[PDB]
Design a protein around this ligand. Sequence first.
Ligand SMILES: Cc1ccc2c(c1Br)[C@@](O)(CC(=O)c1ccc3c(c1)OCO3)C(=O)N2
Length: 521
Amino acid sequence: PLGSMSDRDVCIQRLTGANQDHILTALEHGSEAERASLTAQITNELAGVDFRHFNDVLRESLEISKSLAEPPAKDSFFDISSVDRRRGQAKRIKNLEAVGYKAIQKGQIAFLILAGGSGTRLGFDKPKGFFTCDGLQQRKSLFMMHCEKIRRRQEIAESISGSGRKARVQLLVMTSGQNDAETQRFFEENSYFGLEREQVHFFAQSSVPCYDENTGRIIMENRGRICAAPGGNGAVFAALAAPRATKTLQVKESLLQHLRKLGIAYVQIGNIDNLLANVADPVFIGYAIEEEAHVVVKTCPKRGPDERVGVFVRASGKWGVVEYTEIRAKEIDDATGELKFNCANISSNLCSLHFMSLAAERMKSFTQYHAARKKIPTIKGPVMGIKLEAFLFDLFRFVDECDHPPKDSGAFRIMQVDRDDEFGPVKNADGAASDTPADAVRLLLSQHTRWLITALETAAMGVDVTEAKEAVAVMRSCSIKAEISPLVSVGGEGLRQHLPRVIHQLLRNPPPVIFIRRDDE
Ligand SMILES: Cc1ccc2c(c1Br)[C@@](O)(CC(=O)c1ccc3c(c1)OCO3)C(=O)N2
């Protein structure tokens, strides 16, 4: 009713009565340039952040960081974590896959890419989605390969349905305030990697302030900038809640509300760093649908007892993750010889839109964040401060509140998957001990190699039976690998048509890595 307010006046309103008066002072009485940069930061990088609420978050999170957990019951979750476990369950997997494809066709699926991180650790000062792995004949960014996986899954859904309608997965790209513009530019310059512009939604997350432990004051990086840090993937809820321009222009609604109007039923969430990400996975989707789950998490067996990864647990009937620093944890089940706590968190989730909505509502009053003491660089020298994080898993305790009444068997499910098929995070520069681009590329090639050997062996049972058999023998004894474009195959399908060329190469002059791509690439 009082009309439009300047960005600065909105910031002033947001900081009034927030117990952070040193910031309010900077906004009201700082230099022109200081007032402006602080305004831009609080507006564009901390949009929606409730500063009073975060004082409570700091207080509680500090208290918490100063034994009820039980593992998932043996044999209680869907386990497809090896070749042998998948063989024994082949029909169930195929049936779930068909359910997932129907949902993709129906336009019910969104994929949310966590895209706030940079490639700085990889030696690349651009958003991580821009990163191009060496060692691949495809010269494609991580963003490009994600989009091609969506295109392929959409194409398969259409082939199964026979529908006249296009299968469309909504792509939600969760940027940072600082990297949003450059991310949109990259997509635009590349024609959205073959996607429709209308199915791609860019939305910026908010960072979280850092605090002095003794006083609870927000730390200043400099006179024009508060100390703030990426909040962790729990930022999704606030980010999906932010009002956006809405169409005839109407009152602003959230991306969440926009998705509900588009008929989205599930949101699959994953980090852009995962080279092996099974994007729009129809088995994951089919499992959620058939289980009537509001949350499904993907997990992997631990690599060994000392792997520094969080594991899923249930405590007092509530599901969550216990991080390696907080862990009985390394006990072995007597019968199987497997760790009792053996569902490692690979940050790959599928959530109902109802859950996304309810979790966001609950999170506004939620104060149990993860606090860490960190040395923080500032223009006045380093200081010790508190950083606060929250993760998707912190909200899973609310999952059964989505049903009235809750289901007897609950609405949370675990899907234990094969790590080497599903999880290859690109996090550390080549030459590091783990999670390097080369490590992820090795897993990718190993997976494609398995798919091609399988396709060749099926043909061994149009190409000549004996030539296919000979070609497989060449693959094995020469240790030939394959690299397969997602536009060709996302799960091992679609290779039959390529076998004449593959077989010719294998029998005449095999390269170290057979490259399979669409003719029009
Ligand atoms: C749904 C929602 C809408 C607005 C706000 C919130 C939520 Br949740 C907050 O309570 C939390 C917030 O913005 C926030 C911002 C970044 C985060 C984060 C939470 O978890 C880790 O990363 C908040 O302070 N404002």
